[PDB]
Design a binder for this molecule. Sequence first.
Ligand SMILES: [Mg+2]
Length: 295
Amino acid sequence: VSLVATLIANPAKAALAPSLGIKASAAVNATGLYWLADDIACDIPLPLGMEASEADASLRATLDGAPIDVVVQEQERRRKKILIADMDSTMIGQECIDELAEEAGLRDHVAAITARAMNGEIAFEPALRERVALLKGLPLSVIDKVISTRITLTPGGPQLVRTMRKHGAYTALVSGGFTSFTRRIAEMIGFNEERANRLIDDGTRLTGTVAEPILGREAKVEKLVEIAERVGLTPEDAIAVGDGANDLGMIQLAGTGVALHAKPAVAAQAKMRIDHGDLTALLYIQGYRKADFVQ
Ligand SMILES: [Mg+2]
């Protein structure tokens, strides 16, 4: 069946000039060239018989230097009806556990552990236990404080979720982070549901522990399986996106799995990577034109 390449820039650095899209399509002897968003994203249907690996290296070579992402996939099933998206450093700019640690005066110490867990150098569950234990005693008021003053939504996120919902997709926010954050963040962005770990408290302060059992890599896989079964679909009907090692299970199971702004060891394990685009990249991956977007 037929393949399509999609080139995607960040809308804040929209370097996919018309001449550049034409040069790319000539580089793969393309049948055509379809603009999804001017200066931002185009579709390049590949001639029948080209290996997807060929187009990728060919397009990346032509684009070498420019901050433009490349994805290649079969055209037929590219628009998905499930979104499962990671929260920390994916749909928000921050790591909620690092921002909590700042309130304990321990941001750098905790952030260094978080970085190793993100990269896969330590298992997620013991890293979460270690970091949360350092939050013991923090007043519950800290949560609202952090959300209101230091959490920011990743560009494109609301448009991604809302455009997908407009076209009937079911959308879920998953996280090894905490429900105190995912509940508010899911509501701000517009997700159908969220699932995360739970911080334990004595009613006034954090205990420094997480509700058992701890949700990590396999929990994100299991949630994708649960959603797909519940909506009468399969994981192949889902697009999954995350940034960290603990997202690779759902990224690999989903029909379309995207490593977003991930560091090399993680992006190396995903079939699609978006290093330059924002979350609108996931709409272009699915073939949406900007005219389709919820504005
Ligand atoms: Mg993450």
